[PDB]
Amino acid sequence: TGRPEWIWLALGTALMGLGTLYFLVKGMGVSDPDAKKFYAITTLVPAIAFTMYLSMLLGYGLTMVPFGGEQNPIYWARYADWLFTTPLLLLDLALLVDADQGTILALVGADGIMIGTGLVGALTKVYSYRFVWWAISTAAMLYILYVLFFGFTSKAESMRPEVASTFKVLRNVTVVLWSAYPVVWLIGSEGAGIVPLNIETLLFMVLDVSAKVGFGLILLRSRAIFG
Template sequence: MVDLPVRSVFAVGAALMGLGALYFAVRGLDAEGPRSRGLHVVTALVPTIAFGSYLAMALGVGVAEVPVRGGTLEVHWARYADWLFTTPLLLIALGLLVGADTETVFGAVAADAFMIVTGIAATLSGVRLYRYAWWGVSTVAFLLVLYYVFVALGRRARELGEATRETYGVLRGLVGVTWAGYPVWWLVGTAGVGLVPPPMEVLGFTFLDLVAKVGFGTVLLRSRAVADATDASGSDPSSGVSVD
């Protein structure tokens, strides 16, 4: 049973995600060109999915109790369902921004999906040793995701103009810092060593989600002028390099 303070955090998270989704949707109404529209759709869709997840948890849905040695562990599985959809979308947005090839984006999304699935396995494992083992596998997959973000997609970003490079650099740093916070927070939380009590754990994950989703979208929309010009000319306006 989810207690009132935790539900309150979920409710605040739902409200902020909903406001972010509405803001991004309105910003995208007059987007020009397929790439610009794609960026706006993805940007609005991410917090929309998160809004549904947080609303469900605020209403007591999307929560399960997993039997572990010595008792039970409360698992907010709706959060993992959220991540399974939203994190690939964030990587797709990065790919759209730099005009990455399909193979690179697919590789990043596949590594990300494996990271989330193994993270779910870690959380649902009733044996502590198994939880840590799955956490390790998920963390290795996360390092592979970082490879795609910092190396593979980053290489493509360096071929483009200054405006796109700067925007991608900020987004890359945001993803690297916030996404790294998830496995660390999991490890110190209730599913890990238990140093952080449940209300604080929920607050921490909510903060990370807001930065990783709404913060990401806010920064991404700064590239709208670049995306619009790219759609119109077929090249990055500040470099002349084709992104098709």
């Protein structure tokens, strides 16, 4: 159930909000129309995660789903967060590496499915079926990382050294971080309960703040984002 993890949600909520503040109060005197963009996408990610973590802390983003043979505590807010948050992150990588609108659209449709499917997977009452949805979502995810790692890196080799290198850093970080989510989900309170909801939230809190604030920090503090 949901109560003892309140602390990881409260600390997650705080780091998001400050993460939003620092990024906001940093990109104010930025005139470069490109940087101005990078700040917008990057600043919006924590602003969203903030509202959603806060909803979990206040107990709104928590619902109870019956499966297996019991009433399970499912934090749906996570997906309302990820749904807009993951695409924005993808967009940061795309502008940086200057991706084709056709590939951006594909990655954005791949992503929406990943979360959409992951949300359905978290609310399905037939315990067994949840894993079917987990599969479809993890497949979609790999598609995204295959393109980010191989496809994008290729597009990064035609940009100036600052960009190619910052992209490299960002690329390694998303690929490692992203693949943690599905594992955490599979062993958490949405799949096979091998790990308590207590620790699960402590894990998703580290994985999030790193992917949202961490990632923003790496990028925003480089010159890779200028013309």
